């Protein structure tokens, strides 16, 4: 009865190594046991399950990477169903291969999509550059720039060359996308004509100075037709691959947006299980795990059931039975609670925690704290408003429970 | 607890049995060169009897 | 009961001692094959010298 | 498990031998010898009795098992002979000497006891037979060997007391398979196929070890290593490495794998097993095992041995000559060479040899092949060729391979589409 802290038993168990994983998981689903740490020397390389935890740690990072890419694409995560722990057999390795498959597919497909999109946009610029240039020992260069740079660009050509350069700018029929920012900018083609290699270097240096995109071109309209056919071939090819590239990216992200909820639950459960298994120990000849726990006395049956369940879900017969201890330290203090009593327990616990079996202040607090607060705060109108808000929080509880945890003020009052 | 004490004693006896088995079986492997002589002398005697029959 | 714990202790003690016998048979069967090979090496080596002499 | 507990109950449940003498079921000498077995208790007293009276020792035990229909009595007599030989294996000579005196093999005295109704009695018969046969200089052969092996196969294939009796069957087989003659004789039995089935049906870890230990015994002989390829051992045992936590099961599988790669007659057969291990994820499973520490280092030594031998197989297969050979024979089947980064990084230029011969083969296979796997491999190779040798893009276009991968990116199989999509994406990376 909650007038005092509930009865707890220190217990020891001999845990069969194959069943151990399943046992810990049933105990974590039961949620009524606290593990005593037997390893003061525990550390990243001293934890008995180094690889298993490291795999979980990396698998979580793989999930974070994939999830962030899906969220950046605004694709809805399914967040649906309730999932058990992964089994004791290392199916987690095949899951890790699936995680790598998705990760590597996204990295490769993103890299390719970016490169292909850049090439497609560059060839799109080249289509316009050739079409304008086709209207025309001399030399020349040709390219494209954002229109807003043309005044400074043209004046610098007339300054670096001592008043001598032929230039024709020409506007593009539509704006074109920036490969980095996605900004559609009103770019314009330019062609610059000169004589000799000295002028070639000046016009090129100024084009580089304004970051103008230069391109090669044939010397005559007739050869420019053959180049334009090559460009048409390459840009059409780029479109065909971009279509399937984007389609594949969409399939991969879509499949992953279902898998992530499942995989997250699985990985987080695995990490917790293995972290708990790292609290057990193994002496110089030992085979069965030594472990020790605190459990409520009422639930020694519930943990012994959970231990048997772990075995019955495993390739072994050993029930991993526990004993009560006698060399007992003072157990951790517990009280069962519900939606009403939890808050009233927290405002006591926040100041202090009773000794084992001590009287609990909380049941007296459930009324006495509201009473003293109401004596301090007593006003009919505020009493109504506070009542209305608290009622709203209860009647919309199912909706409200889905809301952001980051609003700690709202989380406190809720 | 007496349970872990008794379990560790059985686990220690188990580790001793396999460690002693390794030493016994390693010593037995060294005997193979000495035991080989019993067959080697029979092959000598077989060839000797055949040789006398050929004479 | 503490008696059923003691039955589990007995079972675990017997189990690791049974595993010791199985490991000893593993060491044994391996070492017998090595013994048969090492005996065979010296037998065939001297048997060839015997065959050459006769 | 249960047979040892039942044997202890049977050692407590001693019979009145004098009643069998009074009922004329046994001789006075048989009754007097077996009564003295319960009084000669120390190792010296037992040894003096059995070594001085060996003909009567054999006669006593044989008569008391053979002439008595009362199952509990035959449980007790079989327990005492199993104990007598378990104390010292040299004692088998008593039954062989009696068999020689009686102008017989030893097997016909014990083999009738496999036909009893009580499961413990017939398994105790199997145990004494296994000791006698495995430790004896006389060999079980022909009809006797076939009958006992058929009994073993029958009982073993039946796969909790039932499974624990089958552990005793497996233990009897493990004792027998110590003898090379019995190993070769067992090769003709479908019991190896039965083991593959029982393992595939997820039996308990105790049986996994006891079965795989029997396979590990067979793996010591080069001839059996070549002949037993038919059973697909590695696929099953690799799943057992991923599924079963037990170090004993792990260790015996590592030892079996070591035995196949060490003992096979030919480098080609050693490589065939190593390739099957690489295909069956074994290298990656070994890497996860190698970083661990154990109370037995033979695990780590076998892991290092296997990782080295699989490493050699990977380096062998990573040769451009092997790649050329696989292409020349059309064997585009996900061989480890296709994903060896070292191979492409250091050798991709070689595909240009004899005026693009290997590239012509890849494009020809992408033109001609119906098999999605061959197409996907061929596409994968085009992609990796371009990835490690970008100069090749123009050659692949000249050979028409660009259009072929661009067709196959819309193939009905996602694996073809994926590999074709990677290939076509790399072809369009730069001019």
């Amino acid at each position: 009865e909650l007038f005092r802290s509930e009865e707890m038993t220190l217990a020891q168990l001999f845990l069969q190594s194959e069943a151990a994983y399943c046992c810990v998981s049933e105990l974590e689903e039961l949620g009524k046991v606290q593990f005593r740490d037997l390893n003061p020397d525990v550390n990243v390389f001293q934890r008995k399950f180094v690889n298993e935890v490291r795999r979980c740690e990396e698998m979580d990072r793989k999930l974070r990477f994939v999830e962030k890419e899906i969220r950046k694409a605004n694709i809805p995560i399914m967040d649906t169903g309730e999932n058990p722990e992964v089994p004791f057999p290392r199916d987690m390795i095949d899951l890790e291969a699936n995680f790598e498959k998705i990760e590597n597919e996204l990295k490769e497909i993103n890299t390719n999509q970016e490169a292909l999109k850049r090439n497609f946009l560059e060839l799109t610029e080249l289509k316009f550059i050739l079409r304008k240039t086709q209207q025309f020992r001399l030399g020349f260069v040709a390219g494209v720039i954002n229109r807003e740079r043309i005044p400074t660009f043209e004046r610098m050509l007339w300054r670096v060359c001592r008043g001598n350069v032929f230039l024709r700018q020409a506007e593009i029929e539509n704006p074109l996308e920036d490969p980095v920012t996605g900004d559609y900018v009103h770019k314009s083609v330019f062609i610059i004509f000169f004589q000799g290699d000295q002028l070639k270097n000046r016009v090129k240096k100024i084009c580089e100075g304004f970051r103008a995109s230069l391109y090669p071109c044939p010397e005559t309209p007739q050869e420019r037709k053959e180049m334009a056919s090559g460009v048409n071939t390459r840009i059409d090819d780029l479109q065909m691959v971009l279509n399937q590239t984007e389609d594949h990216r969409q399939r991969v992200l879509q499949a992953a947006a279902k898998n992530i909820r499942v995989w997250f639950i699985k990985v987080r459960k695995m990490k917790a299980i293995y972290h708990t298994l790292n609290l057990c120990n193994i002496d110089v000849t030992q085979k069965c795990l030594i472990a020790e726990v605190w459990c409520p006395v009422t639930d020694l049956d519930s943990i012994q059931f959970a231990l048997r369940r772990g075995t019955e879900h495993s390739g072994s017969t050993v029930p991993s039975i526990l004993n009560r201890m006698q060399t007992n330290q003072t157990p951790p203090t517990y009280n069962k609670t519900n939606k009403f009593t939890h808050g009233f327990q927290n405002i006591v616990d926040a100041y202090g925690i009773g000794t084992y079996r001590e009287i609990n202040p909380a049941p007296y607090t459930v009324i006495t704290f509201p009473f003293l607060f109401a004596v301090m705060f007593g006003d009919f109108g505020h009493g109504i408003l506070m009542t209305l808000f608290a009622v709203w929080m209860v009647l919309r509880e199912s909706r409200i429970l889905s809301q952001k945890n980051e609003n700690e003020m709202f989380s406190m009052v809720f | 607890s007496q349970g872990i004490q008794q379990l560790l004693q059985a686990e220690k006896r188990a580790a001793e049995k396999v460690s002693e088995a390794r030493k016994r079986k390693n010593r037995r492997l060294k005997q193979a060169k000495e035991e080989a002589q019993a067959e080697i002398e029979q092959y000598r005697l077989q060839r000797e009897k055949e040789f006398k029959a050929k004479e | 009961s503490d008696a059923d714990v003691q039955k589990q202790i007995k079972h675990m003690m017997a189990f690791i001692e049974q595993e010791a016998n199985e490991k000893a048979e593993e060491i044994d069967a391996k070492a017998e094959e090595e013994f048969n090979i090492e005996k065979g090496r010296l037998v065939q080596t001297q048997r060839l010298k015997i065959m050459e002499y006769y | 498990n249960i047979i040892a507990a039942k044997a202890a109950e049977v050692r407590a449940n001693k019979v009145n031998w004098q009643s069998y003498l009074q009922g004329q079921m046994i001789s006075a000498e048989d009754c007097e010898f077996i009564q003295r077995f319960e009084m000669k208790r120390c190792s010296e007293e037992k040894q003096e009795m059995l070594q001085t009276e060996g003909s009567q020792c054999a006669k006593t035990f044989i008569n008391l098992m053979t002439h008595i229909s009362k199952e509990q009595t035959v449980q007790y007599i079989l327990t005492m002979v199993d104990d007598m030989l378990q104390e010292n294996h040299q004692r088998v000579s008593i039954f062989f000497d009696y068999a020689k005196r009686s102008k017989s093999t030893a097997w016909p005295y014990f083999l009738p006891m496999l036909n009893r109704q009580d499961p413990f009695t017939v398994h105790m018969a199997a145990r004494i037979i296994a000791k006698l046969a495995a430790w004896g200089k006389e060999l079980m052969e022909g009809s006797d060997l076939n009958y006992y092996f058929n009994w073993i196969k029958t009982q073993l294939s039946s796969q909790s007391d039932s499974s624990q009796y089958v552990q005793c069957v497996a233990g009897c087989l493990q004792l027998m398979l110590r003898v090379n003659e019995y190993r070769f004789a067992w090769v003709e039995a479908d019991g190896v196929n039965c083991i593959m089935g029982v393992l595939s049906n997820k039996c308990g870890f105790q049986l996994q070890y006891q079965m795989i230990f029997s396979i590990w015994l067979l793996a010591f002989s080069p001839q059996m290593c070549e002949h037993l390829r038919r059973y697909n051992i590695i696929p099953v045992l690799s799943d057992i490495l991923q599924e079963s936590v037990k170090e004993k099961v792990t260790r015996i599988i590592l030892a079996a794998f070591r035995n196949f790669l060490e003992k096979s007659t030919e480098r080609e057969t050693r490589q065939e097993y190593a390739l099957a291990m690489i295909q069956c994820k074994v290298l990656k499973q070994l890497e996860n095992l190698e970083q661990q520490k154990y109370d037995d280092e033979d695990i780590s030594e076998d892991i290092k041995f296997l990782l080295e031998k699989l490493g050699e197989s990977v380096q062998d297969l990573s040769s451009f000559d092997e790649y050329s050979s696989e292409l020349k024979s059309g064997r585009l089947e996900w061989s480890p060479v296709h994903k060896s980064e070292k191979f492409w990084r250091e050798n991709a230029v070689r595909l240009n040899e004899k005026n693009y011969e290997l590239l012509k083969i890849l494009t020809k296979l992408l033109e001609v092949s119906d098999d999605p796997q061959v197409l996907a491999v061929a596409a994968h190779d085009v992609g990796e060729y371009v990835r490690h040798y970008p100069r090749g893009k123009r050659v692949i276009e000249q050979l028409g391979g660009k259009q072929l991968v661009m067709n196959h990116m819309h193939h009905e199989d996602q694996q073809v589409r994926y590999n074709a999509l990677l290939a076509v994406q790399k072809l369009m990376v730069h001019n």
Side-chain angles (χ1 to χ4, degrees):
Chain A
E1 294 184 49
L2 293 172
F3 79 81
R4 74 179 195 204
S5 296
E6 297 193 63
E7 288 72 19
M8 294 298 290
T9 297
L10 178 68
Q12 177 180 103
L13 66 153
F14 304 92
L15 182 62
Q16 191 279 325
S17 63
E18 188 150 288
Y21 176 99
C22 299
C23 295
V24 168
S25 75
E26 294 306 329
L27 291 169
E28 289 251 36
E29 176 55 30
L30 177 65
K32 294 182 177 172
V33 74
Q34 183 162 11
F35 290 82
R36 189 182 181 220
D37 179 13
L38 306 184
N39 302 314
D41 300 326
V42 73
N43 203 352
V44 64
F45 308 136
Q46 300 294 345
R47 66 191 182 165
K48 298 304 187 182
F49 292 83
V50 180
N51 182 50
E52 293 75 10
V53 183
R54 183 180 64 199
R55 292 287 176 192
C56 296
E57 287 167 336
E58 178 56 23
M59 282 177 81
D60 189 53
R61 290 185 292 255
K62 297 190 188 312
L63 294 178
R64 291 171 190 268
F65 163 77
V66 178
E67 181 176 349
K68 287 174 180 186
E69 182 69 355
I70 295 164
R71 287 183 184 283
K72 286 171 182 185
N74 305 301
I75 294 163
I77 308 301
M78 292 304 300
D79 287 330
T80 193
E82 180 183 335
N83 297 285
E85 73 294 333
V86 183
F88 79 89
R90 295 187 177 90
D91 296 3
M92 75 185 293
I93 293 169
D94 299 306
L95 299 178
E96 187 189 32
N98 295 337
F99 291 26
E100 287 172 356
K101 191 178 191 288
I102 298 293
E103 181 198 342
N104 296 343
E105 282 169 359
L106 291 181
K107 286 178 172 183
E108 179 60 16
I109 293 296
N110 286 356
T111 301
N112 293 350
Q113 185 163 318
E114 291 161 31
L116 295 166
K117 183 176 179 179
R118 184 181 56 64
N119 291 354
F120 175 89
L121 292 170
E122 287 174 17
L123 291 194
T124 302
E125 290 168 354
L126 183 60
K127 283 193 64 172
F128 293 109
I129 291 161
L130 291 168
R131 284 173 61 220
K132 299 300 185 181
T133 304
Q134 192 167 35
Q135 296 164 357
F136 300 106
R137 178 59 175 173
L138 274 63
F140 81 98
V141 298
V144 64
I145 196 171
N146 300 350
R147 66 181 181 177
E148 294 74 16
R149 299 185 185 169
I150 292 170
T152 49
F153 174 62
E154 183 179 27
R155 289 302 302 165
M156 285 308 301
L157 293 167
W158 279 76
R159 287 176 65 181
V160 75
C161 313
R162 277 53 171 211
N164 185 27
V165 58
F166 179 50
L167 180 148
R168 182 65 160 163
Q169 77 289 359
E171 298 74 17
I172 299 176
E173 299 180 44
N174 56 267
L176 295 176
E177 184 173 21
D178 183 290
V180 177
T181 71
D183 294 312
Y184 284 80
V185 180
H186 300 82
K187 286 171 177 176
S188 298
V189 176
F190 65 87
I191 310 87
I192 299 159
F193 298 86
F194 56 83
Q195 288 170 214
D197 291 301
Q198 296 296 338
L199 290 181
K200 187 181 73 189
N201 291 350
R202 276 75 184 166
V203 306
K204 189 171 185 285
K205 184 176 177 178
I206 294 305
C207 292
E208 290 174 18
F210 288 98
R211 289 69 166 177
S213 297
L214 292 174
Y215 291 81
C217 175
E219 297 196 19
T220 65
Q222 296 80 1
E223 292 171 9
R224 291 166 193 162
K225 294 186 180 182
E226 293 173 13
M227 178 51 62
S229 180
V231 173
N232 287 337
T233 305
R234 293 190 294 274
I235 197 171
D236 293 347
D237 290 345
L238 284 166
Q239 187 67 71
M240 299 307 93
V241 302
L242 280 164
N243 298 348
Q244 305 316 313
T245 300
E246 291 162 17
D247 187 62
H248 184 215
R249 188 171 174 264
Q250 188 68 17
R251 291 170 194 255
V252 175
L253 296 169
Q254 185 73 0
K258 183 178 182 178
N259 295 352
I260 278 159
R261 175 60 174 185
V262 181
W263 290 351
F264 177 86
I265 294 296
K266 281 182 173 186
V267 169
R268 297 308 294 183
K269 287 192 175 177
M270 284 191 294
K271 189 178 185 288
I273 290 161
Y274 291 122
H275 188 77
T276 306
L277 290 172
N278 289 312
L279 305 177
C280 314
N281 201 10
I282 307 177
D283 201 7
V284 297
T285 62
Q286 183 169 358
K287 187 54 56 190
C288 297
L289 299 175
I290 182 62
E292 296 188 346
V293 298
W294 292 283
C295 171
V297 75
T298 54
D299 287 85
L300 294 172
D301 296 345
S302 311
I303 68 170
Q304 189 55 75
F305 172 76
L307 286 159
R308 180 62 190 175
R309 286 294 302 281
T311 299
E312 290 187 342
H313 301 307
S314 303
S316 67
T317 58
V318 173
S320 303
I321 292 160
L322 66 110
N323 69 271
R324 300 186 180 80
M325 296 298 284
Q326 296 73 35
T327 55
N328 302 339
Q329 300 302 331
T330 298
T333 291
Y334 176 60
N335 312 284
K336 184 175 173 69
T337 55
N338 66 33
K339 297 182 185 177
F340 295 82
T341 60
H342 178 67
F344 294 122
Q345 189 70 55
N346 297 329
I347 61 176
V348 174
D349 291 9
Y351 297 127
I353 305 300
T355 61
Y356 177 53
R357 307 190 298 106
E358 191 155 24
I359 187 166
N360 183 4
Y364 313 101
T365 302
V366 175
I367 303 305
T368 306
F369 174 66
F371 173 65
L372 294 179
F373 171 79
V375 172
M376 296 177 177
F377 193 69
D379 175 88
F380 176 85
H382 294 79
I384 290 161
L385 177 60
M386 181 180 289
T387 299
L388 291 171
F389 176 55
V391 166
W392 173 86
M393 287 196 289
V394 174
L395 269 53
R396 277 69 178 171
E397 172 179 275
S398 58
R399 293 177 179 85
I400 293 167
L401 181 61
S402 73
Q403 297 183 7
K404 295 179 179 176
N405 60 289
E406 298 184 353
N407 189 339
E408 294 189 330
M409 180 61 73
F410 185 84
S411 181
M412 190 283 285
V413 301
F414 181 65
Chain B
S1 68
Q2 295 81 6
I4 191 57
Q5 293 168 357
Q6 292 167 9
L7 182 57
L8 288 167
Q9 288 161 5
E11 288 178 328
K12 184 174 184 285
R13 287 187 300 253
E16 288 172 11
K17 283 184 176 184
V18 301
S19 180
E20 292 302 325
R22 289 176 183 276
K23 291 185 295 182
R24 289 194 300 265
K25 273 51 175 74
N26 292 350
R27 290 171 186 169
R28 179 56 177 153
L29 182 57
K30 300 178 182 182
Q31 301 169 8
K33 296 187 178 178
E34 296 183 21
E35 197 181 294
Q37 306 313 311
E39 297 186 39
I40 290 167
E41 295 303 321
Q42 290 294 345
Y43 287 116
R44 183 185 59 73
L45 291 164
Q46 288 155 21
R47 290 299 298 128
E48 186 179 326
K49 287 175 178 185
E50 292 158 21
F51 172 75
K52 289 174 185 176
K54 293 297 182 182
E55 185 176 35
Chain C
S1 70
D2 299 342
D4 292 352
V5 173
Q6 192 61 36
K7 293 168 202 171
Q8 184 180 250
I9 290 297
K10 285 173 174 184
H11 179 74
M12 289 176 168
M13 292 168 72
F15 174 87
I16 190 67
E17 290 179 356
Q18 289 156 12
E19 179 164 302
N21 291 344
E22 289 176 325
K23 288 169 70 177
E25 287 175 24
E26 201 180 306
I27 293 153
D28 175 57
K30 192 176 180 183
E32 280 193 346
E33 199 68 40
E34 295 303 327
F35 181 97
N36 293 338
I37 292 161
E38 186 58 24
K39 188 178 176 186
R41 286 169 180 157
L42 182 57
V43 170
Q44 294 297 349
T45 300
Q46 190 57 30
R47 180 177 169 266
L48 181 58
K49 294 180 177 187
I50 287 162
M51 287 186 298
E52 286 181 338
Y53 171 79
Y54 279 106
Chain D
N1 189 57
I2 193 163
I3 70 96
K6 188 58 170 185
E9 293 173 10
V10 166
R11 293 185 197 96
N13 190 18
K14 300 188 171 67
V15 309
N16 184 288
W17 298 113
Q18 293 68 34
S19 71
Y20 291 108
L21 178 59
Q22 290 157 8
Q24 314 304 311
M25 296 188 71
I26 70 171
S27 74
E29 296 82 358
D30 300 350
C31 192
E32 178 59 20
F33 185 98
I34 202 67
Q35 186 65 20
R36 285 180 297 141
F37 188 98
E38 297 174 17
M39 296 185 292
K40 301 301 177 182
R41 291 174 187 166
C42 302
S43 304
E44 300 84 352
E45 300 177 325
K46 288 174 167 171
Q47 189 64 25
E48 285 168 20
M49 176 185 74
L50 66 94
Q51 187 166 346
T52 307
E53 300 177 47
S55 59
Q56 182 54 39
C57 178
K59 185 173 179 177
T60 302
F61 289 119
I62 291 167
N63 284 347
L64 274 53
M65 72 181 72
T66 305
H67 310 314
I68 302 181
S69 59
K70 295 181 174 183
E71 295 286 65
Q72 295 82 1
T73 299
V74 182
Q75 296 177 335
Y76 183 40
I77 203 71
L78 290 175
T79 303
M80 290 190 288
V81 297
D82 191 27
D83 293 345
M84 181 172 69
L85 270 63
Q86 186 62 80
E87 285 173 13
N88 183 356
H89 61 280
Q90 295 164 351
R91 293 169 174 179
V92 296
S93 58
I94 278 170
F95 294 109
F96 294 123
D97 186 49
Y98 178 86
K100 288 176 178 182
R101 289 174 194 264
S102 60
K103 302 178 179 181
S104 183
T105 54
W107 329 116
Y109 301 116
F110 297 89
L111 289 179
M113 301 300 106
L114 296 178
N115 300 317
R116 306 293 288 224
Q117 295 298 331
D118 171 52
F120 177 66
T121 300
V122 299
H123 288 79
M124 287 301 293
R127 284 169 58 91
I128 190 70
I129 293 161
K131 285 185 166 74
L132 183 74
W135 303 338
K137 290 179 179 179
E138 183 174 301
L139 185 74
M140 189 186 291
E141 177 61 295
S143 303
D144 295 340
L145 189 65
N146 290 344
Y147 169 69
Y148 183 43
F149 283 1
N150 290 346
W151 190 94
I152 291 161
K153 186 268 291 189
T154 300
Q155 297 292 356
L156 182 61
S157 66
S158 70
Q159 182 64 32
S160 180
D161 61 355
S162 178
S163 302
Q164 294 168 45
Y165 290 120
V166 175
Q167 294 175 21
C168 186
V169 181
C172 294
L173 182 61
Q174 289 171 263
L175 285 175
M176 289 297 283
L177 293 176
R178 299 171 80 268
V179 180
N180 301 72
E181 296 94 309
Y182 301 158
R183 299 180 207 167
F184 284 108
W186 183 252
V187 177
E188 291 164 39
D190 63 341
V192 178
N193 186 36
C194 302
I195 287 160
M196 294 293 99
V198 174
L199 290 172
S200 301
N201 299 345
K202 297 170 178 277
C203 72
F205 76 82
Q206 297 180 300
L207 289 172
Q208 298 167 21
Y209 177 84
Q210 292 167 352
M211 289 189 289
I212 294 163
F213 187 109
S214 298
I215 294 170
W216 163 75
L217 292 170
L218 302 177
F220 283 113
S221 303
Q223 310 86 345
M224 288 189 287
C225 300
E226 183 173 337
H227 297 171
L228 298 175
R229 284 184 290 172
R230 74 191 73 196
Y231 293 112
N232 301 314
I233 303 300
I234 291 158
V236 180
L237 270 63
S238 183
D239 292 350
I240 302 298
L241 291 171
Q242 190 180 354
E243 290 181 27
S244 297
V245 175
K246 300 294 298 182
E247 294 80 22
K248 73 195 297 184
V249 175
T250 301
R251 187 181 66 249
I252 197 68
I253 292 163
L254 293 167
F257 287 2
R258 175 165 193 161
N259 278 8
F260 289 117
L261 299 191
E262 182 61 9
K263 303 300 178 184
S264 297
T265 53
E266 291 182 341
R267 182 173 181 155
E268 290 70 21
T269 297
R270 298 174 192 172
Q271 287 170 330
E272 180 172 34
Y273 282 131
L275 171 61
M277 291 187 197
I278 293 158
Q279 289 169 338
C280 301
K281 305 175 177 170
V282 172
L283 188 153
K284 303 304 295 175
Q285 183 59 89
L286 291 170
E287 286 188 326
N288 287 283
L289 295 162
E290 188 185 34
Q291 298 189 359
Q292 304 174 40
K293 302 298 184 178
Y294 311 89
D295 58 324
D296 183 357
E297 301 196 319
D298 294 341
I299 291 164
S300 302
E301 296 311 316
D302 296 342
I303 287 161
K304 285 181 295 183
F305 173 97
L306 289 172
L307 180 61
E308 289 155 24
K309 293 290 184 178
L310 271 68
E312 290 180 7
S313 181
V314 169
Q315 296 307 319
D316 291 349
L317 295 164
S318 298
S319 177
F320 76 92
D321 190 18
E322 295 306 328
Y323 182 75
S324 180
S325 178
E326 288 179 10
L327 264 67
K328 184 173 179 180
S329 298
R331 299 301 304 282
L332 306 190
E333 300 174 12
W334 303 109
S335 177
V337 67
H338 293 289
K339 297 180 182 177
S340 175
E341 297 187 351
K342 177 176 176 181
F343 162 55
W344 297 105
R345 183 182 67 231
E346 296 174 25
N347 306 272
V349 67
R350 297 185 196 272
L351 278 57
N352 296 282
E353 183 160 45
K354 290 176 177 182
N355 301 321
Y356 318 121
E357 182 173 66
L358 300 190
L359 304 172
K360 284 169 172 175
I361 289 167
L362 292 181
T363 55
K364 180 179 177 182
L365 269 293
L366 289 168
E367 180 168 34
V368 176
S369 180
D370 58 338
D371 182 356
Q373 295 300 334
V374 170
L375 291 169
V377 176
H380 172 79
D381 287 357
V382 170
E384 288 302 297
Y385 172 57
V386 173
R387 182 182 184 174
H388 300 283
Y389 188 82
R391 299 176 186 83
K393 287 179 292 87
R394 295 179 183 187
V395 176
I396 296 299
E397 181 169 59
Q398 288 157 8
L399 296 176
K402 189 188 73 172
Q403 187 62 57
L404 294 174
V405 301
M406 182 161 283
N407 299 340
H408 288 302
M409 80 198 195
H410 304 155
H411 187 281
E412 61 267 24
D413 183 356
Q414 183 57 23
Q415 297 185 356
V416 176
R417 292 192 293 262
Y418 173 60
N419 287 284
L421 182 60
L422 292 183
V424 78
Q425 285 170 343
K426 295 302 184 189
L427 288 173
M428 283 64 153
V429 77
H430 182 53
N431 182 29

